[PDB]
C-alpha cells in the first residue's frame, strides 16, 4: 500500500508537469530505507518492483531538474520535449534521466552546434528584417536618421559573428547565406556610412540656402542647392512608402544617390566656404568670430536689428544699438 501511496505520489507531480528537484528524491528515499529491511520478511515482489521504479525515479528526477535546454534534450533521445516537455511535458523528462543516445547526439551535436549556428545566423536575419532605418523629424519644411550608430555597431557584430562562424568548419552548409550575408552588410556599410555624412552636409547647408540674403547672392550657387534638395526632397518622399531596415540598405534609387548627392553637397559646401573667406577678408574682424556666427550674421544682415546680439563679438565695448 505504501509502494503504491508513492506511485501515487508520482503520478500527481506527473499532473503537476512543474519544475521535483527535492521532493522527488525525499519521498522516495524516506520509504526506501525503512521498506528495505521490511521487504526481505514481506516479499510479495510487486512491493519491491515498485520501491525500484520509485528509486529510479528518485535517480531520474535530480537530472530532469533555451539554447542549452534544447542541446540536453537532443542528448536525452527526446526533441524539444524540454521546450515542449517543460512547458508541459508529462513524463518523457523524467523518463529520460542512455549511452548509445548520446553517442547519437554526439554524432548530431555537432550537426546542432552546425545547426546551433545555422540557428544563430537565422536569428540575425530576423532583427535586420525587422529593423527600419530610424527615421527622425527635421521639419518637413522631411525626416532623417536620427541614430545610424547603433545600426553600424550592429553590422561589424554581425560581420564579426559571420566571420567567427566562417572560421569554425560546421558553418561550410550555410557559408553562402553567411558570404552574401557579409557582402550585403558591406553595401549597407557602403550605404549608411553614405547617408550620415550626406545628412550633416544637408543639415549643415539647408538653412543657408533656403534662407534669403545669402541665397540672393550667388545664383548660380542657389540653383544647384534648389535643385540638389529636390533630389533629396524625393529620397525622404520615397522613404516613407518603405521604410524596413533591408529595403534601406538594398533600395535602387537611394544607393546611387547618395555618392553622387554627396559630391553635389560637398562642392556647393566648398563653394559656399569660399564665399565665406571672401566676405571675412572684406571686414577683417570676421575671422574673430566662429562660422556659425559669420553664417548667421551674413543671413541677418538684411535686418540690421537681428544682428544686435553678435554686435559685441564683432567690436570692443559696443554690445548694442
Not at 132 to 149: A, D, P, S, T, Y
Amino acid at each position: 500500500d505504501s509502494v503504491i501511496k508513492n506511485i501515487q505520489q508520482f503520478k500527481e507531480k506527473s499532473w503537476q508537469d512543474v519544475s521535483l528537484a527535492k521532493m522527488e528524491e525525499d519521498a522516495g528515499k524516506y520509504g526506501e530505507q525503512c521498506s528495505r529491511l521490511p521487504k526481505d520478511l514481506k516479499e510479495w515482489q510487486a512491493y519491491r518492483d515498485l520501491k525500484n521504479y520509485i528509486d529510479s525515479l528518485r535517480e531520474q528526477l535530480p537530472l530532469i531538474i533555451p539554447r542549452h535546454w534544447e542541446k540536453i534534450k537532443e542528448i536525452t533521445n527526446t526533441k524539444l520535449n524540454y521546450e515542449n516537455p517543460d512547458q508541459f511535458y508529462i513524463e518523457e523528462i523524467m523518463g529520460a534521466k542512455l549511452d548509445f543516445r548520446e553517442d547519437i547526439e554526439d554524432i548530431t551535436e555537432s550537426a546542432d552546434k552546425q545547426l546551433k549556428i545555422r540557428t544563430g545566423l537565422d536569428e540575425i536575419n530576423l532583427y535586420w528584417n525587422d529593423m527600419q532605418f530610424q527615421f527622425g523629424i527635421w521639419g518637413k519644411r522631411m525626416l532623417n536618421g536620427l541614430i545610424v550608430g547603433t545600426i553600424l555597431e550592429r553590422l561589424e557584430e554581425d560581420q564579426l559573428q559571420l566571420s567567427t562562424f566562417n572560421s569554425q568548419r560546421h558553418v561550410t552548409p550555410f557559408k553562402a547565406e553567411v558570404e552574401n550575408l557579409i557582402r550585403t552588410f558591406s553595401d549597407v556599410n557602403d550605404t549608411l556610412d553614405m547617408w550620415v555624412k550626406v545628412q550633416k552636409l544637408w543639415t549643415s547647408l539647408e538653412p543657408v540656402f533656403t534662407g534669403g540674403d545669402i541665397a540672393r547672392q550667388m545664383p548660380l550657387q542657389a540653383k544647384q542647392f534648389q535643385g540638389i534638395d529636390k533630389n533629396w526632397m524625393k529620397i525622404m518622399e520615397k522613404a516613407v512608402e518603405t521604410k524596413k531596415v533591408i529595403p534601406c540598405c538594398q533600395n535602387d534609387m537611394l544607393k546611387d544617390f547618395l555618392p553622387d548627392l554627396n559630391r553635389k553637397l560637398e562642392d556647393c559646401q566648398k563653394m559656399l566656404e569660399a564665399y565665406l573667406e571672401g566676405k571675412r577678408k572684406k571686414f577683417p574682424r570676421f575671422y574673430f568670430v566662429s562660422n556659425p556666427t559669420l553664417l548667421k550674421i551674413l543671413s541677418q544682415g538684411s535686418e540690421p536689428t537681428s544682428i544686435q546680439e553678435d554686435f559685441e563679438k564683432l567690436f570692443d565695448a559696443i554690445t548694442k544699438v
